[PDB]
Structures are given as structure tokens and as C-alpha cells.
Design an enzyme around this catalytic site. Structure first.
Site, PDB file in Angstrom:
ATOM      1  CD  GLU A  35      -3.152  -0.799   0.234  1.00 40.67           C
ATOM      2  OE1 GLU A  35      -3.119   0.192  -0.476  1.00 40.67           O
ATOM      3  OE2 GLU A  35      -4.036  -1.647   0.138  1.00 40.67           O
ATOM      4  CG  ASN A  46      -8.971   5.921  -4.097  1.00 41.34           C
ATOM      5  OD1 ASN A  46      -8.040   5.118  -4.261  1.00 41.34           O
ATOM      6  ND2 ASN A  46      -9.428   6.270  -2.880  1.00 41.34           N
ATOM      7  CG  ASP A  48     -13.877   7.122  -5.175  1.00 39.39           C
ATOM      8  OD1 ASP A  48     -12.767   7.620  -4.998  1.00 39.39           O
ATOM      9  OD2 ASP A  48     -14.517   6.652  -4.213  1.00 39.39           O
ATOM     10  CB  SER A  50     -12.074   8.851  -2.041  1.00 35.77           C
ATOM     11  OG  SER A  50     -11.829   7.601  -2.644  1.00 35.77           O
ATOM     12  CG  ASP A  52      -6.519   5.310  -1.093  1.00 38.43           C
ATOM     13  OD1 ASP A  52      -7.695   5.246  -0.686  1.00 38.43           O
ATOM     14  OD2 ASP A  52      -6.171   4.830  -2.164  1.00 38.43           O
ATOM     15  CG  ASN A  59     -11.493   4.882   1.432  1.00 37.93           C
ATOM     16  OD1 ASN A  59     -12.547   5.538   1.520  1.00 37.93           O
ATOM     17  ND2 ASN A  59     -11.448   3.580   1.615  1.00 37.93           N
TER      18      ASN A  59
END
Length: 129
Positions: A35, A46, A48, A50, A52, A59
Site C-alpha cells: 500500500e 482514487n 472516484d 477520494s 488514500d 480512504n
């Protein structure tokens, strides 16, 4: 802060993730590697919209507030910037909530795609724990 592998294993253990909901510590360290590469400062947007944050890439769609994710929850009740500190306590308590969530560590797409099914013990081999 960029953690070393064992240094993070040790922090993750002290905060109680080792076998937390039945996930051995190497799962948590493997998830962190793939990650954030163990870097508390890691941020990734992201598709969408959002973002992280932190060692476990938590997120803003569900878990934290970054002041720019429309129609988002903050189920861990914290600013997402808390997730970027060298003290990993927020990332770890938040991760406990996420993983108790119903889907286990499958919530981490890197864990699922790169850690699950693998020999995750190798991620702590050689550490004093």
C-alpha cells in the site's frame, strides 16, 4: 516517516494488530509494504475522487475527513492528515474498525491481490518481536 520492515512490525505489534481478528502480523506488514511502501506520508487519489492516506492507505470515502471528498463518511472520526504522522496510532485504530467491518483484510485491495494466499510470515522473518 519511512519505516523499516521490522520497525513497523514492532509498532504494529505494540498497538495490537498481531492476530487481530485472526490476521497474523505478516499480513499487516505485507499490506503496508504494497500500500505505502512503509511510508507514513503516502497519498494516492482514487478514480472516484477520494484519496488514500498513510501506511495503510486508508480512504476518505468511508473512514476519514480530508475536506474534499463529497458525500463521504468519516467512520473513524478523524482528519485524514492524522493518518500521515509518524505516530501510527490513528492508522492502527482506524484499521481495526475497517478490518472488523465484515470483509476482513479484503478491504485492502493490495492485501487481497498481493498478500492473501502468500507466505506472509516472510514479511517479519528476521525481526525481534
Amino acid at each position: 516517516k519511512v519505516f523499516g520492515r521490522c520497525e513497523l512490525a514492532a509498532a504494529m505489534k505494540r498497538h495490537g494488530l498481531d492476530n487481530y481478528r485472526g490476521y497474523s502480523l505478516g499480513n499487516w506488514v505485507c499490506a503496508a509494504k504494497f500500500e505505502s511502501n512503509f511510508n507514513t506520508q503516502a497519498t494516492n487519489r482514487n478514480t472516484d475522487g477520494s484519496t488514500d492516506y498513510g501506511i495503510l492507505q486508508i480512504n476518505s470515502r468511508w473512514w476519514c475527513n480530508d475536506g474534499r471528498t463529497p458525500g463521504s463518511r468519516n467512520l473513524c472520526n478523524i482528519p485524514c492528515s492524522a493518518l500521515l504522522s509518524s505516530d501510527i496510532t490513528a492508522s492502527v485504530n482506524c484499521a481495526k474498525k475497517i478490518v472488523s467491518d465484515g470483509n476482513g483484510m479484503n478491504a485492502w485491495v493490495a492485501w487481497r491481490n498481493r498478500c492473501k494466499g502468500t507466505d506472509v510470515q516472510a514479511w517479519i522473518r528476521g525481526c525481534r518481536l
